[PDB]
Write a protein that binds this DNA or RNA. Structure first.
Ligand SMILES: [Mg+2]
Ligand SMILES: [Zn+2]
Lengths: 199, 489, 547, 497, 119, 99
RNA sequence: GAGUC
DNA sequence: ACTTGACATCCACCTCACGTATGCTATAATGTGTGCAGTCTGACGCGGC
C-alpha cells in the first residue's frame, strides 16, 4: 500500500526515475531467547529490490541509455513471536487494539445542547484517516457555517465560489427553479400541486 | 529577622540592582571538562557565591580560617555555599521590555491606566503601528495610532513639538509623562454630571487604580522593565544524574535564549543596523522575557525537545503541582510509616497494633538517646551498629520509650477531623497494622487492602495534643451531628 | 478504504471503494443531507454506534507509521537525486537508514498503546492482549469524554464484554473483546449468528457487522430448541433493531450460537455469574487478573469448561504439534516420535520441546513449566504436554481450593477480613514464587575507573567469605537484607576532614585509600536465594576470571 | 507601490502575534534590483570613503601621527610585526622588506618639506600654494588604510568634534541657561571676529542694563572662553577651514551609512533561504535567521565590486559561515569549541557509513582505526557528546513526577550524620582535658582543633620555640596515650567509621 | 456569616467611605458605634452577599487569596495596591510555619497580640 | 515502609517521595485540615518545620530528642525562602517587616 | 498500570 | 629534654603545550519554510459586542 502511494519516484528533470520491484524478509539476526538475555529488540532484515532507470534528455524518452539495479538494506523490522508478543529491548510488550471514530460522515444533532431558546443544531463531521477536519453547522438563525480544521465559523457558500461556481450555479443546483411566464399584464407560474402543500 | 507583616509592591529596576550581586553576561553555564562555572555565566560563583563550603574557585583559600577572604584571581568570596540559595544576579536589557503579566492578564493594569484597549497597545509594542506621545501641536493627541504611511504624511508637514514613537520604550515614556493626580480630578468631574450607569462603573474603576497607585507609592514607569533580576542558581540547579547524564532546569534554557538574544541586541546596536532587523530583534527580546515569566500566555508556547511545554517560573508557583499546593499547603513529612490495616479484637479502644520493624525505624532517634543515658551504648555510633544487629534488649528499651507515647493514624481521604486519630500503639510482629473495630466507621475504613499511615508527634506538646485533643477515647461524638460516631456495626 | 466506504454509505451511494481525495460532488451532496435533516427528510446518526466506531489492529498502525518514515525520506531522496552526477553514482550510495529505524522505534518504544505484558498469570496475559482502548492518537481524551461514550452502548452485545474495565477514571475507556467476536476486513467488529430458514434453525454460520446487525431479527441462546428443527414456543423471545420482545416462529430470522458469546474471556471463567451482581462481577474479573501462581497447581473444582481453552490459548504451555509416542521425558526436554501417518518424507519425524524453567516475569513473578505426560505415553495432535505455572492437566489453575466456612469469628472476620488456618502454611498452599532482578553497574569517570572487586573498607570476613575471587556471589547462596551481592569500588575525591577527624586518623593509624564503597547490597526486608548470575563484560576491557 | 499594501493586509491582521509572519511581510516590501543594482551602491561606498580620506590628508596631525607610530616600532631595533603589521598595508592597484619601506617613505618626506615654505610665503593658500596643496592631496589618496588603524584615525577627528560640541554646550548652558543672551546676535559676532575678544564688549556696548550687572561672574565667563580658545592653539587649524572639513567629512561618512542599509535590505531574502537550509531542529528559526543576518553584514562590508563576480555566490559563504559557527557557539548548554565541533561532525557522518557497511553498531576498535586516531580519544569524545537533560522532564508517565522529584542532595548531611559530627568533637575535647597542659595545646593548634587554623608542623614550631622534630615525638607520645583502651573506650565505637 | 462578610456603603462618615465602596462589615460597625455616640456623619449601608469564591477573594489576606486560585490576577492586584499583610488568619500562619491563632495557640497567640500592643 | 530521616529533595529540601527513595509520606491539604479542626498547633508546626524543610530545625530537634529533651525549638521553612526568591525573580519586591 | 473509600 | 644533619615528602607557583577564537571560502544560489495538534466538557463570571 505504502509503496504504490508514493512510487514510482520520478526525478525533477523527468529523465531519471526510481522504481520498486519487491521486498524480502530475512531470517532474524537474533533469536527470541537471546534478545531477552542481552536487552535486544527482536527483528528481521528487510531488503528491497530497487531499479535506477535513466532516460535521455535529447532522445525523446529513450530508456535506451542506462539501467542500474540492486537489493538494498532498509533496516531491521521488529518481528512478532509465536505467542503474539514483541521483543522490545529485552522485555515482553503487547500492542493494544485501538477504537476511534471511523473516517467518513457523522450526522450530529445538538438536542437542546445549547441555548435558552432550546434550538436544534445540526452538524455533519468529516473525519479522514489522514488530514485536517471539516465541520458544517447551523447558526441560530439557520444560516450555514463551516469550521475549517475547527478554526472558526465562516459562510459555506464561499467554498463553492472558490470552486468557480457563480451565485447562479449555486442556487440552480441547490434550490428548485420555478418558471414565471409574463404575458400581456397577467403573471402565470408553472406550478406543481405538491408545492402548495399546506399553503 | 522576626517579623510582623509583609508588604507587596511594584518593583523598581534600581531595587533589583540592590539585591543583585553581579551582571550575568554569558549564556554559558559551566566548563565541559573542568566542571566549574564559567566567568560571568549563569552559575558564576563571582556573582552567586561559592559552590563548595569555605572554598574558593582556583583553590587558593580553603579552610575555616578563611572567611570573607575575596580571592584576588577569581573574585569569589570564601564562605557558606548556602548563599547560592539567596544571592540574586541581574541582566541589563538595552530594550526596555514590557511586563507580560501587566498586559496580557485581564483586565491589564496598563490598559486600564491608559484607558486603552488591548490591540492598540499590542500593535504599538510589536512595532505594527506608531503612536502619539504628546503634541504641542493641537492636530493630534495622546494615544494616537498611525500606520507607516500616516506617520510620514503627518511628519512631512509638522514636527518639532510633535512626539510619536513605537514599542515598549514609547509606552514607558507615555507612562512617565502622564499626570495621575490630574486625571483623578478629571474623572471626578465627569462622574459628577451625567452618569450613564454602566459607563459610571468603569469611571469608578479607573479612579480607584489611580488613587491606589499614588497611595502605594508605586511609579507607573516601573511597568516597563530595564533590569531583569536573575534567580539564585541553587533554585535553578544543574546536576549530574548518577548514570553520567545531566539534568538542568527549564528556566535555564529560557534564560539562556534570553541572554543569547540580548547579546545579539547589543551587537546590532553597535552596528547601527537597519531598523527593520532592529524591531525584529526586539520582538524576539520580548518573546524570550515573556516566555520566561509566563510561557504560553504569549500565545505560541515554547516546547521542550519533545513537544511537551517548557515550564516557566509562574507555572512553578501557580499550578496545583506548583509551590502553593504541593509544597506550601501540604508537604512531604518525616517520622511517618504505612501499610495494610487488619482487625484487632483484643485491642481496647485507645490501642492499635503496630508492626515491629516499622516502629523500630519510626523511633530510631529516641532509641539512641535513651541508649546513651542508660550507658547501654557507648556513643551514638555504637548505638546505630546496635540497632542494625537487632538485639532483644533493644526491644525492651524501645517498648519503654513507646510507653505512653501516643501515635497517630491517618487514612485517606481525610474527610473530617477524625480522619486522623491518636492511639497508644502496641508492638506486634508481622507486617500489618492492627486497628480497633469501633473506629472503622469514622475512617470509612474496611479490610480488603486499604492502606493507612502512621505519624509521630515528636515533642512533649505534640504528645500532649495527640492524647488530649486527638485521642480516640476523647472524641466519640461526631463534629458533624451531635450523635455518637464510634459505634458498632 | 475505510473513510470512503463509510462516507458513501452515509449519503446512500453505491461504490464501495474510492480514491483518497475528496471529489467535489461529494461535498455538495452532504450539505444536501444536512439541509434534509433540518427539514425532516432523514434523521441523525449516533456517535457511539458500533458502525460509527472502527478499530485499529496492528497492520494498519504499522502502515501509518511506516508511511511517516517514508515522508521524511522522500525529502532527502528527491533532494540528492538532482545535484549529483547521474551516471557513475549508484543506488546504494543514495539511500539512508536512520529515519526508518527511528520511526519504527518510536512506534514500538514510545507508544502508549505498546505496553509491558501483564504476566501475573496466564489470564492476565491472555486478557490483556485482547483489551481495547478508546484513548491514544486520533482518539478520545479525559476531559473530552462525557457520559455518552463511556456508558454502555447496546451495540457492544456479543462484541465487547460489558463487564471488563478498570475501576476509576479509565472506566468506560478500556474494554475486553467478547469471546467469539472478531474484526472484519474494514476493522468493524462482527459477531456470528445462526441462520433461521422459515422457522427451522440451520447449521449455517454468518458473521454480521454492527451495521448489518441493525437490520435483522435474532433469538437469544436461551430460547428452547425443538429436536434440531424448530422452536419450542409458538410465541418466542428475541431482539431486533436495538430493542427486545415477543415474536412468532415464522418471523424468526437468526439466533445466537451460545450464551458465552456475550461475555469476555475473563468473565467467562467466573462460574455462577448468573447470580452475581455486575458491580462485584466487574471487580471479580479484575481480581483474576491480579492473581498469582503458587507452586502447587490444584485444578479448579468448580469451573466453566472454559479453563481448558484459556490454558491452551495463553500459549504458555507446550502443545503437541504432531502426536505419536513420547521418546524422552525430562524436566527440561520432551522429545516425541511422530505417527508415521502424519510424518513428512522431507525431514525426520522427531519433534523437540525444550521447556522453559524458572525465569523472571515482569512483575517479579516466577515462570515455571511442568511436563504433564509420562514416558512412552501416547498423545495426539493438540495434546497438552507441559503446563505453564498456573495450569493443571489441560486446565487453567489460577490457584487452589480450600474448605471455607461462613460465620463470625471473635471479630477476626469483621469487614471482609479473613481468618485462615495455620494449615495453609503447613501445606505450603498459596506460597508464591518470586524472581527479582538485581543489577550492578560498573562505569568509568573523571574520578577514575570504577571496578568490580572483593575489597571493601571496614567490612568483616562475614561478607568476604560469601564472595568469590572477583567480588561475585556464589551460585546458590542464601542471602538477606544488608548482605553484599556484588562488590564495587569508586574513586573518591579529596578527603577534607574536620580537624577532629584529622587527629583521629593519626591516632588509630588506618589511613584508608581514596575509595568509596559502591557495592550492590540486598534491599532490607527481602531475602532469598541467588539462583543465577549473568555478566556483561565490555568489548574493550579484558575479562574477569568469573567472566 | 509597496507600503500601501502592508497597510491593507495589516488592517486584516487580527492582532497577528507571530513574529514569523511579521518579518516575512516587511521584507516582502523590498525587491532585489539585480545585475549592477548592487554595484551602483558599491560605487557610492568607495566615493564616501575616499572623500573622508581627503579630509584625513588635509589634516596635519594625520601625517605627524603616521610617522610617530612607525617610529615607535622601528626604534625598537627593527620589528616587522606588531604595530608595523597593524599599519602600512599599502594596496597594489606580504612579508615586508625594509628596502621598499625606506624607499616608499622617502618621497612623502620630500613633499612634506616642500609643502612647508610655500604656505608661509604671503598667504596660507594664495593661488600657487593652492595648486601645490592639491598636488600633495593627490599623493596621500594613493594609499588605502587598513580599517582598524583607520578607525583610530577618524577617532582623532570625530572625538575632536565631540570636544568642540561639548565645550560649546558648556558655554551655551552657562550663558543661555544662567544669563540669557540672544543666539541671533551670537551668529554675526562669533563668525566675524573669532580670534579677538572685541565681540564680548562690543555686545555689551549696546547698553541694556543686563550687560551692566555681569560683574559678579565676569571672572568665570570670559575665562571659560579659555578652553575654547585653547583648543584652537592646540590644533592650529583656522576656524573657516575647520567648518568646511567638519561638515564635508560628515558628508562622506553619511554617504556610506545611508548606503549600506540599501544593500542589506535587497539581500535580506538571501539570508532567509540560506538559514532555512540548516533550520533543522538544532536551534530555532528566529535564532538562526538572526545569525544569518549577521553573516550578510560581513558580506556587504568585505565585498568589493572590483572582483567582477556575482554577489549571491560570495555572500552565501559569509552567511553560511555565520550560521555554522553560531550553532557551535551558542546552541548547547555546555559551550563547545570549534575543533571539537568538527571532530563531532566526522563522528556522526561516518557513523552512517560504518553502520550500513559492517551491518550493525560501530564498536570503538573498528571506528578508531577508520578515523585515523588513537582509541583513547574516541571514548573521551563519546561521553562528552551528550547534551543536558531537562530537570522538569516528565518522567512520570502520569504527570506525577517532574524529574526534580527524584533528586537527592549529597551536600546536606543527614541529622544522623550531624549526630556523628557533634558527638565526635565532644568526645575529643573530653579526652583532651585528660592530656597534660602543653601537650593538649600542641595538638589543639597543630590540627586547628577547636581552633579554626591548623598551623603546619613548622608554624607550630615557630610559636613554640624553634623545634620541629620534638613535636613529631610528642605526636607519637600523644598517640600512645590515646591508644590506651581505658581512655578510648569512648573512642573505640568510632573504630568502624 | 462568612458569606455576609463584606458590605457596600451609600454615604460617608468622616472616613474614606463614599459611594459604593466595599469594606468589611465589622469595620463599618466600628464606625457606627464611635460616631453615633459622639455624633459625627452617619453611614447608610447595604449588606452584600458573596458566595464562596467571591468571599475568599475579598479577604484581608492576599496570601490566603493567592493560595486559593487565580494566582496571576491576585498578584497584580496586590502589587499595585502596595498591600500589607498583617498575618491575622490561619492559612497565612500555616504557610509561614507559624503557630495557629486557635486552640493551643490562642492562649499563646493572645500573648503575642499583647506583645504587639506594647510597641 | 517507614521513615525516620533520610534523603531530602533538592530544591524544596523536603523528604523525597515513596518507599522507592526511603521517602517521607506526603501530608496533604485535607490532612492538614484535620489538625486545624482540633486546636493542635504544635503537631502542625512539627509537620511544617522540623519534619520537613527546616534543616537547622530538624537536625537540632533530632539530637535533642536523642538527648532526652523532646523540646521543639522551631525554625523557618526552607520552602518559604524558595518561594520568596522566586517572587523576587519575577520582579516583585516582597520584604519581611521588622516588628 | 492497580489499591482504598 | 632539645638541636643538628640528611633525607624524604609534599604544596606552591611558574612555565610550556594545547585549547580557544577568528577569519575566509568569490559558478550561482534570494517570500517560503516550519509545522501541526489542538478541539469540542461544562456551568460560569466578565468583557465586549
Ligand atoms: Mg476497602
Ligand atoms: Zn580563586
Amino acid at each position: 500500500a505504502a509503496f504504490r502511494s508514493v512510487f514510482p519516484i520520478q526525478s525533477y528533470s523527468g529523465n531519471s526515475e526510481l522504481q520498486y520491484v519487491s521486498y524480502r524478509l530475512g531470517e532474524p539476526v537474533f533469536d527470541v531467547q537471546e534478545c531477552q538475555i542481552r536487552g535486544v529488540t527482536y527483528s528481521a532484515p528487510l531488503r528491497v529490490k530497487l531499479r535506477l532507470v535513466i532516460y535521455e534528455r535529447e532522445a525523446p524518452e529513450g530508456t535506451v541509455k542506462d539501467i542500474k539495479e540492486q537489493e538494498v538494506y532498509m533496516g531491521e523490522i521488529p518481528l512478532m513471536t509465536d505467542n503474539g508478543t514483541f521483543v522490545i529491548n529485552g522485555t515482553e510488550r503487547v500492542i493494544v487494539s485501538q477504537l476511534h471514530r471511523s473516517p467518513g460522515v457523522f450526522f450530529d444533532s445538538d438536542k437542546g445542547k445549547t441555548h435558552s431558546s432550546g434550538k436544534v443544531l445540526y452538524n455533519a463531521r468529516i473525519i479522514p484517516y489522514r488530514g485536517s477536519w471539516l465541520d458544517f453547522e447551523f447558526d441560530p438563525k439557520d444560516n450555514l457555517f463551516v469550521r475549517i480544521d475547527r478554526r472558526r465559523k465562516l459562510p459555506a457558500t464561499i467554498i463553492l465560489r472558490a470552486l468557480n461556481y457563480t451565485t447562479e450555479q449555486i442556487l440552480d443546483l441547490f434550490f428548485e427553479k420555478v418558471i414565471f411566464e409574463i404575458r400581456d399584464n397577467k403573471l402565470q407560474m408553472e406550478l406543481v400541486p405538491e408545492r402548495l402543500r399546506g399553503e | 529577622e522576626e517579623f510582623d507583616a509583609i508588604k507587596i509592591a511594584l518593583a523598581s529596576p534600581d531595587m533589583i540592582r540592590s539585591w543583585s550581586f553581579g551582571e550575568v553576561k554569558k549564556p554559558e553555564t559551566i566548563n565541559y571538562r573542568t566542571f566549574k562555572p564559567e566567568r560571568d555565566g549563569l552559575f558564576c560563583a563571582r556573582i552567586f557565591g561559592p559552590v563548595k563550603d569555605y572554598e574558593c574557585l582556583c583553590g587558593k583559600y580553603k579552610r575555616l580560617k578563611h572567611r570573607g577572604v575575596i580571592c584576588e584571581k577569581c573574585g569569589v568570596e570564601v564562605t557558606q555555599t548556602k548563599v547560592r540559595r539567596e544571592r540574586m544576579g541581574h541582566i541589563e536589557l538595552a530594550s526596555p521590555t514590557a511586563h507580560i503579566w501587566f498586559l496580557k492578564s485581564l483586565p491589564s493594569r496598563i490598559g486600564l491606566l491608559l484607558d486603552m484597549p488591548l490591540r492598540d497597545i499590542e500593535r504599538v509594542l510589536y512595532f505594527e503601528s506608531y503612536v502619539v506621545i504628546e503634541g504641542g501641536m493641537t492636530n493630534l493627541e495622546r494615544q494616537q495610532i498611525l500606520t507607516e504611511e500616516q506617520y510620514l504624511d503627518a511628519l512631512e508637514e509638522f514636527g518639532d513639538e510633535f512626539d510619536a514613537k513605537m514599542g515598549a520604550e514609547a509606552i514607558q515614556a507615555l507612562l512617565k509623562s502622564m499626570d495621575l493626580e490630574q486625571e483623578c480630578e478629571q474623572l471626578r468631574e465627569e462622574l459628577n454630571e451625567t452618569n450613564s450607569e454602566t459607563k459610571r462603573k468603569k469611571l469608578t474603576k479607573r479612579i480607584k487604580l489611580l488613587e491606589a497607585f499614588v497611595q502605594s507609592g508605586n511609579k507607573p514607569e516601573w511597568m516597563i522593565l530595564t533590569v531583569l533580576p536573575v534567580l539564585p542558581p541553587d533554585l535553578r540547579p544543574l546536576v549530574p544524574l548518577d548514570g553520567g547524564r545531566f539534568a538542568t532546569s527549564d528556566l535555564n534554557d529560557l534564560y539562556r535564549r534570553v541572554i543569547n538574544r540580548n547579546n545579539r541586541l547589543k551587537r546590532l546596536l553597535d552596528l547601527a543596523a537597519p531598523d527593520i532587523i532592529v524591531r525584529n530583534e526586539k520582538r524576539m527580546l520580548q518573546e524570550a522575557v515573556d516566555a520566561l515569566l509566563d510561557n504560553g500566555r504569549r500565545g505560541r508556547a515554547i516546547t521542550g525537545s519533545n513537544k511537551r511545554p517548557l515550564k516557566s517560573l509562574a507555572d512553578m508557583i501557580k499550578g496545583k503541582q506548583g509551590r502553593f499546593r504541593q509544597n506550601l499547603l501540604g508537604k512531604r513529612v518525616d517520622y511517618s510509616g504505612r501499610s495494610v490495616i487488619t482487625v484487632g479484637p483484643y485491642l481496647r479502644l485507645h490501642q492499635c497494633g503496630l508492626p515491629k520493624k516499622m516502629a523500630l525505624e519510626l523511633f530510631k532517634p529516641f532509641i539512641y538517646g535513651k541508649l546513651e543515658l542508660r550507658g547501654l551504648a557507648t556513643t551514638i555510633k555504637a548505638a546505630k551498629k546496635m540497632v542494625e544487629r537487632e538485639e532483644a534488649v533493644v526491644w525492651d528499651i524501645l517498648d519503654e520509650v513507646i510507653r505512653e507515647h501516643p501515635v497517630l493514624l491517618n487514612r485517606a481521604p481525610t474527610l473530617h477531623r477524625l480522619g486522623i486519630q491518636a492511639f497508644e500503639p502496641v508492638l506486634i510482629e508481622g507486617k500489618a497494622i492492627q486497628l480497633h473495630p469501633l473506629v472503622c466507621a469514622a475512617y470509612n475504613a474496611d479490610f480488603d487492602g486499604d492502606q493507612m499511615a502512621v505519624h509521630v508527634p515528636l515533642t512533649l506538646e505534640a504528645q500532649l495534643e495527640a492524647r488530649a485533643l486527638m485521642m480516640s477515647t476523647n472524641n466519640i461524638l461526631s463534629p458533624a451531628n451531635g450523635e455518637p460516631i464510634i459505634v458498632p456495626s | 478504504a475505510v473513510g470512503r466506504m463509510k462516507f458513501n454509505r452515509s449519503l446512500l451511494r453505491e461504490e464501495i471503494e474510492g480514491s483518497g481525495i475528496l471529489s467535489k460532488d461529494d461535498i455538495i451532496d452532504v450539505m444536501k443531507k444536512l439541509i434534509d435533516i433540518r427539514n425532516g427528510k432523514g434523521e441523525v446518526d449516533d456517535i457511539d454506534h458500533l458502525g460509527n466506531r472502527r478499530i485499529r489492529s496492528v497492520g494498519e498502525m504499522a502502515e501509518n507509521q511506516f508511511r511517516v518514515g517514508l515522508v521524511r525520506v522522500e525529502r532527502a531522496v528527491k533532494e540528492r537525486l538532482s545535484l549529483g552526477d547521474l551516471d557513475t553514482l549508484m543506488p546504494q550510495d543514495m539511500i539512508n537508514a536512520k529515519p526508518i529505524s527511528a520511526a519504527v522505534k518510536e512506534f514500538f518504544g514510545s507508544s502508549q498503546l505498546s505496553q509491558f505484558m501483564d504476566q501475573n498469570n496466564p489470564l492476565s496475559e491472555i486478557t490483556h492482549k485482547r483489551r481495547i482502548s478508546a484513548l491514544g492518537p486520533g482518539g478520545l481524551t479525559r476531559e473530552r469524554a462525557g457520559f455518552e461514550v463511556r456508558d454502555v452502548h447496546p451495540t457492544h452485545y456479543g462484541r465487547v464484554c460489558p463487564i471488563e474495565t478498570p475501576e476509576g477514571p479509565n472506566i468506560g475507556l478500556i474494554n475486553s473483546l467478547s469471546v467469539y467476536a472478531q474484526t472484519n476486513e474494514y476493522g468493524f467488529l462482527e459477531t456470528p449468528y445462526r441462520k433461521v430458514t422459515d422457522g427451522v434453525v440451520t447449521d449455517e454460520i454468518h458473521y454480521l457487522s454492527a451495521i448489518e446487525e441493525g437490520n435483522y431479527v435474532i433469538a437469544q441462546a436461551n430460547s428452547n430448541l425443538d429436536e434440531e428443527g424448530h422452536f419450542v414456543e409458538d410465541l418466542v423471545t428475541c431482539r431486533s433493531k436495538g430493542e427486545s420482545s415477543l415474536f412468532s416462529r415464522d418471523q424468526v430470522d437468526y439466533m445466537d450460537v451460545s450464551t458465552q458469546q456475550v461475555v469476555s474471556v475473563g468473565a467467562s471463567l467466573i462460574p455462577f455469574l448468573e447470580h452475581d451482581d455486575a458491580n462485584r462481577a466487574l471487580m471479580g474479573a479484575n481480581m483474576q487478573r491480579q492473581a498469582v501462581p503458587t507452586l502447587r497447581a490444584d485444578k479448579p473444582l468448580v469451573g466453566t469448561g472454559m479453563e481448558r481453552a484459556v490454558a491452551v490459548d495463553s500459549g504458555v504451555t507446550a502443545v503437541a504439534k504432531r502426536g505419536g509416542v513420547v521418546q524422552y521425558v525430562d524436566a527440561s526436554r520432551i522429545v516425541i516420535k511422530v505417527n508415521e501417518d502424519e510424518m513428512y518424507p522431507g525431514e525426520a519425524g522427531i519433534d523437540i520441546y525444550n521447556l522453559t524453567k524458572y525465569t523472571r516475569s515482569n512483575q517479579n513473578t516466577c515462570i515455571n513449566q511442568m511436563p504433564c505426560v509420562s514416558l512412552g505415553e501416547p498423545v495426539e495432535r493438540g495434546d497438552v504436554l507441559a503446563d505453564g505455572p498456573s495450569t493443571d492437566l489441560g486446565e487453567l489453575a489460577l490457584g487452589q481450593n480450600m474448605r471455607v466456612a461462613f460465620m463470625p469469628w471473635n471479630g477476626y472476620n469483621f469487614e471482609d477480613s479473613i481468618l485462615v488456618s495455620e494449615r495453609v502454611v503447613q501445606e505450603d498452599r498459596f506460597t508464591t514464587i518470586h524472581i527479582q532482578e538485581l543489577a550492578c553497574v560498573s562505569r568509568d569517570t573523571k574520578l577514575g575507573p570504577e571496578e568490580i572487586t572483593a575489597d571493601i573498607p571496614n567490612v568483616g570476613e562475614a561478607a568476604l567469605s560469601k564472595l568469590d575471587e572477583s567480588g561475585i556471589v556464589y551460585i546458590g547462596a542464601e542471602v538477606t537484607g544488608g548482605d553484599i551481592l556484588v562488590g564495587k569500588v569508586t574513586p573518591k575525591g579529596e578527603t577534607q576532614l574536620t580537624p577532629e577527624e584529622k587527629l583521629l586518623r593519626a591516632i588509630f593509624g588506618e589511613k584508608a585509600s581514596d575509595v568509596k564503597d559502591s557495592s550492590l547490597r540486598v534491599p532490607n526486608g527481602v531475602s532469598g536465594t541467588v539462583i543465577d548470575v549473568q555478566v556483561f563484560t565490555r568489548d574493550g576491557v579484558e575479562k574477569d576470571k568469573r567472566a | 507601490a509597496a507600503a500601501q499594501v502592508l497597510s491593507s493586509v495589516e488592517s486584516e491582521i487580527g492582532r497577528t502575534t507571530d513574529p514569523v509572519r511579521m518579518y516575512m511581510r516587511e521584507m516582502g516590501t523590498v525587491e532585489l534590483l539585480t545585475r549592477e543594482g548592487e554595484i551602483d551602491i558599491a560605487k557610492r561606498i568607495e566615493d564616501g570613503i575616499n572623500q573622508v580620506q581627503c579630509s584625513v590628508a588635509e589634516y596635519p596631525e594625520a601625517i605627524t601621527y603616521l610617522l610617530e607610530q612607525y617610529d615607535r616600532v622601528e626604534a625598537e631595533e627593527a620589528r616587522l610585526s606588531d604595530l608595523i603589521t597593524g599599519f602600512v598595508d599599502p594596496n597594489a592597484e606580504n612579508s615586508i622588506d625594509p628596502e621598499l619601506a625606506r624607499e616608499k617613505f622617502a618621497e612623502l618626506r620630500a613633499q612634506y618639506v616642500v609643502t612647508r615654505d610655500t604656505i608661509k610665503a604671503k598667504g596660507r593658500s594664495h593661488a600657487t600654494a593652492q595648486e601645490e596643496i592639491l598636488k600633495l592631496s593627490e599623493v596621500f589618496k594613493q594609499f588605502r588604510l587598513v580599517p582598524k588603524q583607520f578607525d583610530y584615525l577618524v577617532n582623532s577627528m570625530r572625538v575632536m568634534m565631540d570636544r568642540v560640541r561639548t565645550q560649546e554646550r558648556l558655554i551655551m548652558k552657562l550663558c543661555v541657561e544662567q544669563c540669557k543672551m540672544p543666539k541671533k546676535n551670537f551668529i554675526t559676532l562669533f563668525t566675524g571676529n573669532e580670534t579677538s575678544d572685541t565681540w564680548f564688549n562690543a555686545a555689551i556696548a549696546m547698553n541694556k542694563p543686563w550687560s551692566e550687572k555681569l560683574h559678579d561672574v565676569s571672572e568665570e565667563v570670559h575665562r571659560a572662553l579659555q578652553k575654547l580658545q585653547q583648543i584652537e592653539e592646540e590644533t592650529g587649524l583656522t576656524i573657516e577651514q575647520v567648518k568646511d572639513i567638519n561638515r564635508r567629512m560628515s558628508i562622506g561618512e553619511a554617504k556610506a551609512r545611508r548606503a549600506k542599509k540599501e544593500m542589506v535590505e535587497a539581500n535580506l531574502r538571501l539570508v532567509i533561504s540560506i538559514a532555512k537550509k540548516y533550520t533543522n531542529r538544532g536551534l530555532q528559526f528566529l535564532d538562526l535567521i538572526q545569525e544569518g543576518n549577521i553573516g550578510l553584514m560581513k558580506a556587504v562590508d568585505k565585498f568589493e565590486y572590483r572582483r567582477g563576480y556575482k554577489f549571491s555566490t560570495y555572500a552565501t559563504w559569509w552567511i553560511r559561515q555565520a550560521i555554522t559557527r553560531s550553532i557551535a557557539d551558542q546552541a548547547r548548554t555546555i559551550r563547545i569549541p570549534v575543533h571539537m565541533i568538527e571532530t563531532i561532525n566526522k563522528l556522526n557522518r561516518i557513523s552512517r557509513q560504518m553502520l550500513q557497511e559492517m551491518g550493525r553498531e560501530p564498536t570503538p576498535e573498528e571506528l578508531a582505526e577508520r578515523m585515523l586516531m588513537p582509541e583513547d580519544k574516541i571514548r573521551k569524545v563519546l561521553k562528552i557528546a551528550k547534551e543536558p537533560i531537562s530537570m522538569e522532564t516528565p518522567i512520570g508517565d502520569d504527570e506525577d513526577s517532574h524529574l526534580g522529584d527524584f533528586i537527592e542532595d549529597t551536600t546536606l548531611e543527614l541529622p544522623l550524620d550531624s549526630a556523628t559530627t557533634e558527638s565526635l568533637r565532644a568526645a575529643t575535647h573530653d579526652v583532651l582535658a585528660g592530656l597534660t597542659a602543653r601537650e593538649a595545646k600542641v595538638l589543639r593548634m597543630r590540627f586547628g582543633i577547636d581552633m579554626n587554623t591548623d598551623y603546619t608542623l613548622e608554624e607550630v614550631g615557630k610559636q613554640f620555640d624553634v623545634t620541629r622534630e620534638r613535636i613529631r615525638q610528642i605526636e607519637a607520645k600523644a598517640l600512645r596515650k590515646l591508644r590506651h583502651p581505658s581512655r578510648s573506650e569512648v573512642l573505640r565505637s568510632f573504630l568502624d567509621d | 456569616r462568612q458569606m455576609l462578610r463584606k458590605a457596600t456603603i451609600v454615604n460617608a462618615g468622616s472616613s474614606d467611605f463614599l459611594e459604593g465602596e466595599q469594606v468589611e462589615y465589622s469595620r463599618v460597625k466600628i464606625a457606627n458605634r464611635e460616631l453615633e455616640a459622639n455624633g459625627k456623619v452617619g453611614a447608610t449601608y447595604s449588606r452584600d452577599l458573596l458566595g464562596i469564591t467571591k468571599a475568599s477573594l475579598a479577604t484581608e489576606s492576599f496570601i490566603s487569596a493567592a493560595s486559593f486560585q487565580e494566582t496571576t490576577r491576585v498578584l497584580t492586584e496586590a502589587a499595585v495596591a502596595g498591600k500589607r499583610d498583617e498575618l491575622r488568619g490561619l492559612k497565612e500562619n500555616v504557610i509561614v510555619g507559624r503557630l495557629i491563632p486557635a486552640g493551643t495557640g490562642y492562649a499563646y497567640h493572645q500573648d503575642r497580640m499583647r506583645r504587639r500592643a506594647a510597641g | 515502609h517507614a521513615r525516620s530521616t533520610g534523603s531530602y529533595s533538592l530544591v524544596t529540601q523536603q523528604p523525597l517521595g515513596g518507599k522507592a527513595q526511603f521517602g517521607g509520606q506526603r501530608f496533604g491539604e485535607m490532612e492538614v485540615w484535620a489538625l486545624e479542626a482540633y486546636g493542635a498547633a504544635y503537631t502542625l508546626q512539627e509537620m511544617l518545620t522540623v519534619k520537613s524543610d527546616d534543616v537547622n530545625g530538624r537536625t537540632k530537634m533530632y539530637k535533642n530528642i536523642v538527648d532526652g529533651n523532646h523540646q521543639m525549638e522551631p525554625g523557618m521553612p526552607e520552602s518559604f525562602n524558595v518561594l520568596l526568591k522566586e517572587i523576587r525573580s519575577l520582579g516583585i519586591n516582597i520584604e519581611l517587616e521588622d516588628e
